[PDB]
Structures are given as structure tokens and as C-alpha cells.
Design a protein around this ligand. Structure first.
Ligand SMILES: COc1ccc(C(=O)NO)cc1NC(=O)c1ccccc1
Ligand SMILES: COc1ccc(C(=O)NO)cc1NC(=O)c1ccccc1
Ligand SMILES: COc1ccc(C(=O)NO)cc1NC(=O)c1ccccc1
Ligand SMILES: COc1ccc(C(=O)NO)cc1NC(=O)c1ccccc1
Ligand SMILES: [K+]
Ligand SMILES: [K+]
Ligand SMILES: [K+]
Ligand SMILES: [K+]
Ligand SMILES: [K+]
Ligand SMILES: [K+]
Ligand SMILES: [K+]
Ligand SMILES: [K+]
Ligand SMILES: [Zn+2]
Ligand SMILES: [Zn+2]
Ligand SMILES: [Zn+2]
Ligand SMILES: [Zn+2]
Lengths: 398, 411, 398, 414
């Protein structure tokens, strides 16, 4: 069974934000326009018995003063009156400002993705599904008491915390263009959650982390030392180079960690057509670096949560995540999925102009240093955690 | 004549679900142990002449395919493939609404009871009819929800409104938003839904609250202004709850002038419910429940009274037993005195450690909801305009002015 | 066994306040000058496993933001510098000002009285002691989030709450000159704690409550209706009139409520020599209204908490509470306690001049309308709480 | 020679109280299962030639009436004999109640710790041992005439008193326990030749209340003025900040005081996993255990030392800490590498180290204004005052050199 999170109120909440507009509705309507929904198990988003239960779930990672502040932020933006100077000061102290502005449903919007990614984790845990997809989630920048990168609540941290609490190890794979700093930070002292983010990094580029700090590469503290992995890449990298850079790392993490679950953040802003215009990945399925990585992770047969994230060209994000969705269905059920190269007619058909194809409209040694560095960190992690593994099989992956 | 729905097979079926266990048995036996059953006309559950007439009753609201799936789920649990699992999930026959050996017979029994209750009002055998086995307001046309599989309320309202200018007033006192009843009659002016409930972010089911400034949706098309909602913050006690909906209930009866009232009376607003959200009681010198039930019965409009939520089963029995005795008192004009000590009967031991009828609870300018009164009353004036009904400002004003709140009433 | 709370640190902490200076030391050393401590079982004040444990005990009644504010008030008065405007506002919002000022030990001072009255409740409960005395406690004005009348923490509410969660009914008797509002308020909705205060009341006199409010007497709410009792008396009242005014009320409450514990606030500011100069009660034992009432309450043979309270002529409060101690020793153990009419030599002897006597230095129908009102309230309480009581056996006490 | 206090009867008696159960047996069996017992010279607990010599040893510190009452409480609890009302009053007069109840073996239990720590003190005096460990000892709360905090007789005070009157002689007492070592501090409050230093949690309502502001720090009186040192810390401290908190205070105390003996109370309730849940220390040994760091530093001074136990109420984790301390003592003193396997060895109490059966405690250490630099300064000014009063060399330059390693030389008074 492959699961997918949605519901009518959930789609409305995921579409109420000023920054991601209707992206979620394009994504699920293209998945549905391609008749994928009957192949998928609808996973409904989690609801709670009371305010206290919701609070106890969210403050599993977030500080209640921050949860209080984010709820107050919604109240203030549902009135017509300006914030007081005191309330601006309060919001600033949580970075609820600038890139994380308030808006009338910011708290419900932010919490939907928590409700979605918690239900996805539960569906994996009771073994109802082997993979669950949540395209409303994947907000990896949110920190304990701080908004960041338009992430107000870290739904991934919460879902990961719910899987690891059911030895139970989790491997977190972050394919987003940006460094998954909030997730990496939450589990910085924890060795049961190995995080690996591949991203672009360059001076002044958001969020700033995931790279050299001679400067050193930090990678965990305490019992968690060597448990945060990072591959930063320069601009222009295409599908094949990105694939080759990430593939051996993915395979060696699986061999050595033997994760009980895999959580994948699939931010679509690496696409060549994302307005960031940093990377050159595609959604091509002859090969898309995204599809290479999902298929590799799915070949491990570990229960897996696939999450969204960045993606600012909304129709191409829809084009990526549709292919990811059918690829999961193929790989898990074993059932050939035949996708028309033409976009089908549906509500949002006119957004996929002017060509209406499913392919996106794009025509196409420092990594070896990073590879030796990471393999050494993996040996160190295996050492520190009394984990038995063949150095030669793993060293053979490169 | 006050009617009540029971039967032997009825009670075995109401007692057969994993979620609600023997709760219906406790309720009916507490009512029996207080010697109320001789005051009440037994209303027998509806049965049909064929699977085909049954299927026809149930699909007057529910899709044929959701009903087939509910049937298949039950036969399945009496003996699943990847396609079965996908089909069940396609109807939300999972998680909060799981299958179990009698899941279909259990959901159908509430339809039998509530529909039979409806007919006893229509043919005037009963002024009021009670069904503590029914009240399942979350169930959708093609979707199970919140342990609601078939929506007996929608089906009974539908029978009431199809009998021979008939308007039904639907009053939902349950802790949760009656989304299922509200969504079924959303485009219909002759069924007015009113729900008082808790709403807050992440609280089931998420509707019946606010949705430029946010707004209340309240019906569409010919149903504009006919879906009313009063969402309240946690902590409310009997008096503020009673003050909250009392005037709204009289104002709705004055303007709509319904030919029937249907009341879902789920008990999860009790201070002692495991939800621990509202702080209502079953006290009777006052219980916001009894206060509202007594106000509704004072209109002398034929009335269906339905169960619902309530997850402390002894306390739910304590409340519905009192409600039953109140209804006998209000309709027959006949004093029903109920001993504070729970009588000898086979479930006496469930009423511990006190073994008394009042629930074991100790009740102890900002939080008003006067802008809600003002909005709701403006909704009711629109509803009257769209539907060409008399809107009697004087009577409604005089109502709210008893409280000092005439100014909230629009002309 | 009769128990008394003291300890060397406890004594230092009860004596660090600006309002009551060394009273507690005058009290315990006069008890000691009279060879009374060997007859008494020392009940040490309670201490906690951790900050969290202390916080849980104190917020059984007090709000944690209030406890936070009181602790902050101590730290602030252990710094040389002035409070900020923001800190003044904060303290004001808990009435930590005016009559309840900060001082270097205000939190430790307030908390000690709680530690002692909680150790006393516990020695009653485990039955180590039939009666326990804490002259360090009895701060009946402190509310959930508000200091009042130099009371910052309500030790009595907390000791009482510990008694009723050990069916259990507590009778609380408040002999202080002032209305015990905070204790009456804390149990305003509880029928298991019946509070009875007798006090002066007149317009402008602190705290204002405990009297007509044709105004009515409030007496509880909810299931607590009729469970708060009050007898306000005109100024000038003497031992005999006071004794006769309360004596029938006390015997009635006992007969009808049948308390599991009795908690007695015994504030000494009804004394003729108290600077309030309102009542004319003495410590005379030929008869002191205090001694009469204590001895009546003790003849009931219910486990009893005896607490201090007001008392602003320190040597005379010491004179009263010494006699109270000896009476308790005598009434519980059965052995006569010969107390010399002269103050024995000790550390503080010079404070009892210029005559150094144990007797304090003093030469000595509205109540029938109050009695008939209270008797009816008692009947309303009994009827509300399905209690059996011979109406006429009670009515005869008057 | 590293000595350790043990014996069959000693073990039976240290395992006979209600509060500390079989904790001593788990400690000694864990040290035995890691094969450490052959590295160690067993120090037999002291026995006396008569009841009177026992009684005079114990009343070197404790009053005759308190000891007599301790004897009677034990006699009382050995019959069906419920107490007379006067029995009850006598016991309460000594706090032989609540936190220090009677039980059938309360006097033997209490005396056993004195027997171990005195024997250990004799072995340092006659130079048979450079270091001696007693994990049955370290009952720092006991007063002259008062039991306290489940301490009934103060073996620490009695041990220090034997050392300090052996044939100028100064003892440094170092109290790492979660709680203020109030009883050792009171005993020597008027005595310059035994300098007490306690690190601990203090907060309002926390046992036992002393060792903090009073706003000034009291520090001893008359001749003992400035000889009682205290460093109270807020909850939540980890191994590194605690190590950095006391490290330089300890090196400076050793530089100035020049003690002939060090006595270390090493109670384990600062461990992250202690039910007190106040400090966050560990027993880790690669990120280094505050405990091991301080024990390693005290042994580097090469001064004859007594290592005592104390608090510690997670019994498996206490054994994990003390077993690692024992191996490090052997390593520092004998020069002999002690490698301790991360898997708990097979032995009778293996089943108490579940569900991991590892030697590292099951804890995960996670994470300007919390520093305590004013305490360092207050403490160093106190230490200069002690040196003047007592006419000792205050070597400013060495202490400065010491704090300047941290970048904190400016904290050192001239
Ligand atoms: C501060 O800006 C960001 C912060 C975080 C993310 C992100 O997707 N993180 O995963 C993306 C952005 N980028 C953007 O918000 C952006 C949107 C449209 C065009 C260009 C850029
Ligand atoms: C999805 O969960 C629900 C869904 C619907 C209702 C309900 O009664 N609606 O009227 C109640 C619940 N509540 C519960 O299932 C619940 C049961 C026991 C304790 C706490 C909560
Ligand atoms: C606001 O003032 C008070 C508040 C409370 C009490 C009291 O004793 N309560 O029990 C007493 C007072 N009275 C006084 O504090 C006072 C002190 C010296 C002379 C005269 C009066
Ligand atoms: C009065 O209580 C004590 C008194 C003294 C000490 C102590 O270890 N002193 O060193 C410890 C305690 N603490 C405890 O007895 C305690 C035991 C288990 C859980 C929580 C607390
Ligand atoms: K990334
Ligand atoms: K990690
Ligand atoms: K409702
Ligand atoms: K409607
Ligand atoms: K009083
Ligand atoms: K009361
Ligand atoms: K210590
Ligand atoms: K000293
Ligand atoms: Zn991104
Ligand atoms: Zn409900
Ligand atoms: Zn007073
Ligand atoms: Zn300790």
C-alpha cells in the first residue's frame, strides 16, 4: 500500500498561504488528472481530542511560548488592527516577521502540515502503508522557537520523532536545494536519526549552514557525533552529476545504518526551471536526479515517508511530484504506470502552458574530496555506535 | 405521549461496536432502574420487507457504493486483499471508523430506530420520541467519519421534511460540530441546522467556525443563511452555555416556526467526559443540557431527541436518564422525582465510587460571545428575507431584552 | 503526641521579615524558657527533592506565574540596584508592593511557612501527632496570584489541601482579628472544607470581607453553597462575650460536620494590647477567649493543626501562644502544665518588662441575630450535603 | 597501593538499610566483575577491643546522648516493642524519625561506615595505601546530636579527625555530592586545619538549605574563618561546565592550603539519570565525566587521599560511576592501564543493568549568562583571606598562571 495525505479542509489550509498560494491544489489535481488516486490509500490528517493534546504533540519539539506566539500571530492577523509595538517585539523574538510574515491562517496553515506528516508516520507505524506521501509537508527550516524559510512548524521533526519512538533508527534524506538545518539541528545530539542533506551552499545563500565552518565540517555533538551528513554543491549541477554525487552516499548510509524508516524531503527547487535557477535537475523519466534517488531509496524496501518542501515554479513542481508519485506506485505495488506525455484536461490545465507536456521545458573532483570525507565520517559513526559493517563493500560504492 | 426506541435485538446491536461498548445498555437500564419505562411508549425499530426496500431507505442519503462497501466490510470481518483495503480507504472505512463483525448491522440499527422515531411523530403517536441508540452526525454521503458510518439524523430529518411549508429545526448540542447534518442540508432552506460546539485548531472535525477578514459560511444557494454555528472556547460551564444558546434557540423557534425539532444530545460536553473540554453537568436543583431540553420542549413542537457522543458511559447514562425524566415531566405534566442514589440494578457497580446520580464533579469582562449573538441574529434576519418569512423584531427584541441585550437584535 | 515546627534554619527564615522581625524567636524561646519543648515532638519543615517538586507543591494552589514573580522579587532585592519600570508593573500586577513589599529573603520567608505547615499536615496524616503547632504559619490572606496583608504564600490552603486528599472533611477555624478571606476563597466551591472565621469587620477595615455584602451574607457557591461561615463582631468585645459568641457555633459545626481534621488559625491581634486596639481579649487562665476556644476544639479529639497568624505586640503574642502550647500539651497528654506567673530568665527576658509577668498587662443581641442566621446556614449545609443531625440537640447549644 | 574497604560482614551491613538496599553489593560486584579486585589492597573495616573503646571513638564527634539513643532505636526495632510516648519524644529530639527512621540494624549499619572510613584513614596514615576507597561511607549530613538525610553517624567527620591529629597537618575536604555537605562543614567550622569545599545544588526548599547566600556567604568562624568554601550551582549543569566550575578552584585550594590528605565525598546523585534529575553528569570516559575529571585532577597532586561514596539513588548507575572511578584510581596511582569493556560482564546482578547492559549510563547529553565567574572571584578572595589569617604563603603567580590557562587570570586577587 502506498499512502497519500489529503482531505478537503486540508487542501484548503495548504492553499491559504501567501507564499505557496495554490501549489498544493495544482499538485494533487495533476496527480488526480493522471488517474493515480485510485492506486493510492488516502491517509487523512491527524486530529486531536482537545487543545491540550494538540499542544502536547506540537511541544514535543516546539516551545510552548513559541506555539503561543504563533497562535497569537493568527489572532492578530484575523483582526483589522495593526500590531502594537509590544507585539511586534514579541513576534520578532520568534523571527515571526520578514520571511515568516503573519497572515490570517498562519497557525492553521502551519499545523495542517504537522497533522499531515504525523498521520503519515502513524500509517507507516501500524504498517497500513509501506510508503506515505505528503506534498503538504516538508518544512525543514523551522527550529524549536523560531520560524525560518517560511517554515513555522517543523512537521518533519515531529514525524521523525514519532517514528523513532515506536534499536529504532531513522535515516533522513533532504534533496531540497536548501540545507535542512532545522531537522539537522533537532537531532544534532541524537545518533538514532542520521540526517543527510545535499544542497547548494555559497556565501550569503540561505540558510548559511551545511558546509565548511582551516574551517572544519561539523557533523553532530555528544553521542550524536558523526550523525549529521552534508554534501554542498556548486551551481549548475545537472541530473547525472547530482545523481553520481548522491548515489554512493545513499547506498552506504543504508548498508551501514540499516534504518528502520527513511524520511525523504523532496523539495523541488533544484529543478532547472525553479526561479532560483541554481541547479539543473529535471523531471525526465527516459534521468531525473529526483527519480534516481527515490527509486534507489525505494529499492531498499524500508518503510518510507516522502515529503514535499520548496518548489516555486508551481506547475513544474507539480510535474516533478506527479512523476515521483507514479514511480512510488510502480515500485511498491509492482504495477506498471503509463503516464501520458501530455497534460490531461483538468481544472488547472491552463497553468501548464504553453506546451502542455509533462516534461519540464528545459534543454541541458570537489565531489571526490567530499566523498572521501563522508565515507570517513560514516566509518567514524559506525565505530562510535558499535555498528558492524564491511569497509570493503562500502568503499566499493565509490 | 413520550416515545422511546428500544428492543432486544436493537439493544444487542447498539451494544456490539468496539467504540461504544455497552453504553446503550447502561442508559436504558438506568432509565429502567429509575422506573421510567412504564411512563414511556416503546417505539419499535423500523424493519423492511426486503433488502431492496432497506437499500432504498438508506440510499435516500447515502451512495449505493458506500453502502455496498459498508456491507462488504462486515461480511469481510465475519470471515482483506490490497484492492479491498484500497476500496475501504476510499470511503474512510479505516482508522477512526474501522470494520468489525457487526459494523453494518450496528450502523443500520440507528437508522431503523431514528426512522421509526420519525414515523411515530409524523402519525402523532408521540409528541416526543427519544433514541439513545442514534445521533450519529458525522457520517457523510460517501464517507464514514468519527465512528459515524450511516447518518440516521439525515435520514430521519428527511422523512420528517418529506411528510405532508414543513420546516425542521436541527439543534446539535454535542461537543463536536455536526458537519454531517450541516453538509447534507447545506442547500436546503426547510432544514435549519444549528450547532453549538467546541472549535479550535486541530480539533475534530475542524468546521463550524471562521473561514480580508475571515467569515462564517452558512449555507449556499437556496440554503444561504440556513446553517448556524456557535463555536465556543473550552472551559464553559452550565450557565454561560445556557446563556449562550438559550436566546438563540427561542429566536430560531420564533422566526423559523419549525414543524418538528430534531435534537442531537451527545454528552461529551460533561465536565467528566475524557475530552475534558466543556464543564457541563447533569445537575437538577442547573445543567445546560436540561435547561436547553426544557426550553425546546416548552415550544410544544413535535421533537426527536437523539444521543451522540459521550465517552464516560456511567456519566452519559446519568445525564440521559435525567433528560428522559425531564421530557416525561415536560410533556405529560407529571412529576418525576429521581432519587439521588442510583437504584439496585445489574450495572449498579458501574456508578462507583459514589453510586449517586449527580456526576462526580465540583464546579468552581472578557470571555463573552456577544458579537456571536449579533452575527447569528443578523444571519437569522437574512434567512427570513431570502425565504419571505415574517421576521418579528418585536418578539425577538423582547426576548434578548430580558437579558439587557435588546441592542444586539437587528430590525 | 503534640508536635511543634521548628529548626535552626526555619527560625532564621521566619525572623528575616521586616513586618514580624524576631517575633517567632520570642515565641519559641519563651516556649523554651518554660521547659515546654521536652514535652513536644519537633516536626521538621518539609524539604523537596528538586525545584520541580517544590513548584508542584506550591502551585497546588498558587499560579506558577505568581510563584515566578515572587522568586524574581527576591533576586531583585538581592541586587543593589533599583527595579525597572517593567519589573514594577510586573510586581504591581501581583500586588507585590505597598503592604507586601519585597525584601532580600521574601521568597524564602514565604516558602518556610509553607514547608512547616505541610510537614505539620503530614505528621497528622501518618498519625505521628494528634495535634501539631506551627507558630511560623497562618498567612490566611494570600490568594492564588496575589499577595495580601503581608501574606505571600497561603500555607494554610496548602496544608488543608494536603489534608483533604489523604470521605475527608476539614473544619477550618480562624480566630484572627481579620477575616480569613484567602482560605475562605480557596474553598469557596468545596463542601469538604468548611471555613469559619470570626473577626472584626467595619467600613474601611482590612480586608473588607466576612460580613454583609438589604445586603446579604455570601456563604459559598456551587456545591460549596453554605460552607463558608463568618461572624463579624463590633469593636471592644471582651473575653467572655467573644467566648459566648463563638462557643455555640464551634460545637454546632463539630456535631454537624463531624470533621476529619481541624485547622485553627490563632492570630493574636485580638489581644487588648495589640496595637490595633480593636478587641479586648486576654491570655488569662484563672478566661482568654483564645484558650476557651482552643480547649473546646481539642475536647473534640479530632486531629488538629494549630497555626499562628497576626500579632503585632511581639512579647504579648509570645505570652498568648506559650499558654496555648501548654494547654495543648495538657489537653492531649493529660499531664498538668504548671506555668509560673513570672517570665523565667532567658535570651529575651528583657523584652517582657517592666513587670515581667506572663499575664498581659491589662485591666478589663446583634450576636443573637447572627446565631440564628448561622444555625440556619448550618441546616442548609447539612440538607445540601445529605448529613444526619438532630436539629434540636444542635439548636439547644444556643 | 590503592586500597578498598570490604568484607563479608561489612557488605551484609551496608546492604541492610531500607533506603540504600543492596546498592553497596551492586557496586562491589560490578567492580569484581570487571576484574578490578585483584588490583586493590582490601582494607578491612575497623573493629574495637571493647564497647567502651567503640563508644569513645564515636564520641570523638557525636554526643553521648545521641549515640545512646541510636543504640536504643536499634534495640527497640529488634523486638515487637512499639515505642513508649517517651521513647517517641526521645527519638524525635534526635531526628531519629521521618528521613532517618529506625530499622532492626540502624546502629550496626551506621557504625559500619565509621569502621570502614576509620580503617581507611589508618591505612593512609601508616602509608600502607596512597589512596583508599570506601563505597560504604560518605555520610556527610550527620550532626553532633542529630541524624539527617539518612545519615546517622558521620564517618567523614570521624575519618578527617583521625587524619588531622596524626603526626602543620592539614586536610582538604572535597564534597562532589548533589547536596551541601553541611555536617562535615559544621564539624570543622571553627577549625583552620580542615578546609571544607562543597559543590552542590542549592535552591529554595532544597535539602538541606545551607551552602549558599545568607546577602553574604558565611565561611567559618573564629579561627576557622574563611576555611569553609561553598559553590552552589543552578540545576541543569553538564559534565563540562561542572568540570570547568571546580577544576581551577581545586588546583588553587591545593596550591595554597598544601594539605597532607585529601578526602573526597563522591556521591553520585549528580548523574543525569539520578531520580533527583537536577544535574546532568555522566560516567563517560572517551565528552568526559565531571566526576572522573575531578578525581583525575585530585590524584594528580600525589597527596594521600580518601575516596568516599554518598548519595546515589539509581543503584545500577551509581555502580557504573563508582566502578569507573575505581578503575581510574588504579590507573592514576599504579600507572597501570585499566581497560573496561563497554558490555557489563556476566555476574549475579547482570540483570540489573538492563535493557542495554552497557557501562555508559543511558543518557543523551544535549544543549553568556550562566557563567559563575563572580563565584571564582569571591572564592579566590576568600582563599587569600584564609592564607593571611593562617600565615601561609599565597603564591599569587602560580594561581594566576592557573586561571590564565582559561583566560581568567584577572580573576585572581594579589
Ligand atoms: C529566503 O528565501 C528562501 C528560503 C527558503 C527556501 C526553501 O525552499 N527552503 O527549503 C526558499 C527561499 N526562496 C524563496 O522564497 C524564493 C521564492 C521565489 C523566487 C526566488 C526565491
Ligand atoms: C475522532 O475522535 C472522535 C471523533 C468523533 C467524536 C464524537 O463524539 N463526535 O460527535 C468523538 C471522538 N473522540 C474520541 O474518540 C475519544 C474517545 C475517548 C477519549 C478521548 C477521545
Ligand atoms: C493591611 O494591614 C494589615 C493586614 C493584615 C493583618 C493581619 O494580621 N491579618 O491576619 C494586619 C494588618 N495590620 C497591620 O499590619 C498593622 C501593623 C501595626 C499596627 C497596626 C496595624
Ligand atoms: C531528604 O531526602 C534526601 C536527603 C539527603 C540526600 C543525599 O543524598 N545527601 O547526600 C538525598 C535525599 N533524596 C532522596 O531520598 C530521594 C530518593 C529518591 C528519589 C528522590 C529523592
Ligand atoms: K537539502
Ligand atoms: K543526528
Ligand atoms: K454540536
Ligand atoms: K440548511
Ligand atoms: K478571623
Ligand atoms: K467551603
Ligand atoms: K556537595
Ligand atoms: K573549617
Ligand atoms: Zn528549498
Ligand atoms: Zn462528540
Ligand atoms: Zn490579623
Ligand atoms: Zn546527595
Amino acid at each position: 500500500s502506498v499512502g497519500i495525505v489529503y482531505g478537503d479542509q486540508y487542501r484548503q489550509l495548504c492553499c491559504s498561504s501567501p507564499k505557496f498560494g495554490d501549489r498544493y491544489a495544482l499538485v494533487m489535481d495533476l496527480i488526480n488528472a493522471y488517474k493515480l488516486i485510485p492506486e493510492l490509500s488516502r491517509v487523512p490528517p491527524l486530529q486531536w481530542d482537545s487543545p491540550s493534546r494538540m499542544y502536547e504533540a506540537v511541544t514535543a519539539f516546539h516551545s510552548t511560548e513559541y506555539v503561543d506566539a504563533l497562535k497569537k500571530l493568527q489572532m492578530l492577523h484575523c483582526e483589522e488592527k495593526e500590531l502594537t509595538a509590544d507585539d511586534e517585539l514579541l513576534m520578532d523574538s520568534f523571527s515571526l516577521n520578514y520571511d515568516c510574515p503573519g497572515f490570517p491562517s498562519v497557525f492553521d496553515y502551519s499545523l495542517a502540515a504537522v497533522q499531515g506528516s504525523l498521520a503519515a508516520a502513524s500509517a507507516l507505524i501500524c504498517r497500513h502503508c509501506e510508503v506515505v506521501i505528503n506534498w503538504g509537508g516538508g518544512w525543514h527550516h523551522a527550529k524549536r522557537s523560531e520560524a525560518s524559510g517560511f517554515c513555522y512548524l517543523n512537521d518533519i521533526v515531529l514525524a521523525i520523532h514519532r517514528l523513532v519512538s515506536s534499536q529504532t533508527r531513522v535515516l533522513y534524506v533532504d534533496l531540497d536545494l536548501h540545507h535542512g538545518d532545522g531537522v539537522e539541528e533537532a537531532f544534532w545530539y541524537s545518533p538514532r536519526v542520521v540526517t543527510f542533506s545535499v544542497h547548494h551552499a555559497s556565501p550569503g545563500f540561505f540558510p548559511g549552514t551545511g558546509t565548511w565552518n582551516l574551517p572544519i565540517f561539523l557533523n553532530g555533538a555528544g553521542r550524536g557525533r558523526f550523525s549529521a551528513f552534508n554534501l554542498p554543491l556548486e551551481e549548475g549541477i545537472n541530473d547525472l552529476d547530482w545523481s553520481n554525487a548522491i548515489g554512493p552516499i545513499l547506498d552506504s548510509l543504508n548498508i551501514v545504518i540499516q534504518p528502520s524508516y527513511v524520511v525523504v524531503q523532496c523539495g523541488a527547487d533544484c529543478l532547472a526551471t525553479d526561479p532560483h535557477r541554481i541547479f539543473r535537475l529535471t523531471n525526465f523519466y527516459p534521468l531525473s536526479g529526483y527519480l534516481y534517488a527515490i527509486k534507489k531509496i525505494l529499492s531498499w524496501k524500508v518503510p518510507t515517508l516522502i515529503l514535499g518542501g520548496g518548489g516555486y515554479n508551481f506547475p513544474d513542481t507539480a510535474r516533478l511530484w506527479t512523476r515521483v508519485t507514479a514511480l512510488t506506485i510502480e515500485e511498491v505495488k509492482g504495477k506498471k504506470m503509463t503516464i501520458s506525455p501530455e497534460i490531461p484536461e483538468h481544472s488547472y490545465f491552463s497553468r501548464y502552458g504553453p506546451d502542455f507536456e509533462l516534461d519540464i521545458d528545459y534543454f541541458p573532483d570537489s565531489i571526490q574530496k567530499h566523498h572521501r570525507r563522508i565515507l570517513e565520517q560514516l566509518r567514524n559513526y559506525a565505530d562510535l555506535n558499535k555498528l558492524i559493517y564491511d569497509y570493503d563493500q562500502v568503499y566499493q560504492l565509490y
